[PDB]
Amino acid sequence: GIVEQCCTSICSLYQLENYC
């Protein structure tokens, strides 16, 4: 999910919008 994508790997900040 987003947490693994952003914390273990790298995510763009644009990927957090879906979780607002």
Next chain:
Amino acid sequence: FVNQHLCGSELVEALYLVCYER
């Protein structure tokens, strides 16, 4: 943050920034 890992309170800070609405 550019091309950096975001975990814990750093991830939280990024989420507030993206999700804030005026």
